[PDB]
A paper describes a structure:
The nonamer complex crystallized in the P212121 space group at a resolution of 1.7 Å, while the decamer complex crystallized in the P6122 space group at a resolution of 2.6 Å. The nonamer peptide adopts a canonical extended conformation promoted by the N-terminal (Ala1, Gln2) and C-terminal (Tyr9) anchors, which are deeply embedded within A/B, and F-pockets of the [name] groove, respectively. This anchoring results in a “curved” conformation, where the backbone of residues from Asp3 to Ser8 is pushed toward the upper part of the groove while the remaining residues are maintained within the C, D, and E pockets. Thus, the X-ray structure of our ALK-derived nonamer neoepitope is consistent with established structural features in the PDB, suggesting a trend where the peptide backbone conformation is defined by its length and anchor motifs. Here, both neoantigen p/MHC samples show a clear unfolding transition with a highly reproducible Tm of 53.4°C for the nonamer and 59.3°C for the decamer complex, suggesting that the decamer forms a higher affinity complex with [name]*15:01. Notably, the buried surface area (BSA) between [name]*15:01 and the decamer peptide is 1,986 Å2, relative to 800 Å2 in the nonamer structure. In addition, the decamer participates in 25 polar and 21 hydrophobic interactions with the MHC residues, while the nonamer forms 26 polar but only 11 hydrophobic interactions with the groove. A structural superposition of the nonamer and decamer peptides (2.7 Å backbone heavy atom RMSD) highlights the changes in residues that are oriented toward the solvent, suggesting that the two epitopes display very different surface features for interactions with TCRs. To further explore the basis of this exclusion we performed structural modeling of the self-peptide/[name]*15:01 complex, using our solved X-ray structure of the nonamer complex as a template.
Author numbering:
A (entry chain C): 1 to 9
B (entry chain A): 1 to 276
C (entry chain B): 0 to 99
Write the structure that this text describes.
Amino acid sequence: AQDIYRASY
Amino acid sequence: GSHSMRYFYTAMSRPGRGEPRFIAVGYVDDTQFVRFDSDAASPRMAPRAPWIEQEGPEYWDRETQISKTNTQTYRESLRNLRGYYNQSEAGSHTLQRMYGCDVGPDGRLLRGHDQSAYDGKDYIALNEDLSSWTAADTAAQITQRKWEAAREAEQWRAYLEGLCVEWLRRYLENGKETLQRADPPKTHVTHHPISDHEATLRCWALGFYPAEITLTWQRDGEDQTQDTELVETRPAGDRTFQKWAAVVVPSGEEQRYTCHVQHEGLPKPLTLRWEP
Amino acid sequence: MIQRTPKIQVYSRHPAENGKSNFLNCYVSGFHPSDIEVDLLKNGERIEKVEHSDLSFSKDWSFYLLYYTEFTPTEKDEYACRVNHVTLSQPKIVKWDRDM
């Protein structure tokens, strides 16, 4: 399973 | 054996042809098990291996939500990176991310990974300590500072040491009949005359899984690294892989040459010769 | 930015034997950026029912794809893979050779 989104580049 | 889980994200801008495409695929070793494509008619994280199909609706809902969020956020990230490099809005660019974890035979963490590339060039990577980053250039330093401020490394460490390995262990058990089965290469040597003076000996390995293999030629017991043509390991389309290694040998000297094969599926390493 | 030109291999899934239905593969790899055009050919003409794998990439960030279709090798029929990419000024054609 994926990690969640937290931060853009 | 040892095993890995990896997610591969690709975001590709295409000015004048809509918003950037986002694709996400997940692998356990050399086995793809999920895919997402924002260009699909109905974007959804979808199964690509039978052993993931038993995950319930809550699993698919979560994985799809993550991918749909990343479709949006990787478009922001591409806008940011364009600015970081003072680039025109006219050009197409690519942002790639790889991340995941490796475990050994006992299921324990060997190490974690999270790294990225922009237009095919290394951009930023999480160090093996899962605490700090290596930034490639002053643009990636902006990303680094932003991620440091947000305590990203701590979050990545928690995922990589926790959920990443827990899911990978689950997948390895649910898919054990294939994921934890190494299929040895089927091997043979062919002979192809070039001229009156020389012929090619080609050492074949077919039908093996996983892809990792070592295929070499020796002459009188010396490795022929510089004089071996070695093709890239290639997928057959049935989960397995193929490779060959070739050497040009003088007519009549064929029995001086031996092909050696190492692969996880083999009881022991093979030595082969041309058998006319 | 630097672009990378594709490597191309053409081959069958199973050992080739004339008259026996099999799968023809064209593996393109090592390229960047990811846009690429691939055709499988039978006696110079494009095969219509060609599928391909999902785009992914290798550790060195280069992309790869597998194009494939059913085929029945014979002594006379010629098969090939035709590839175009931004790095190529013209399409590159690689012939299927059952010895490689």
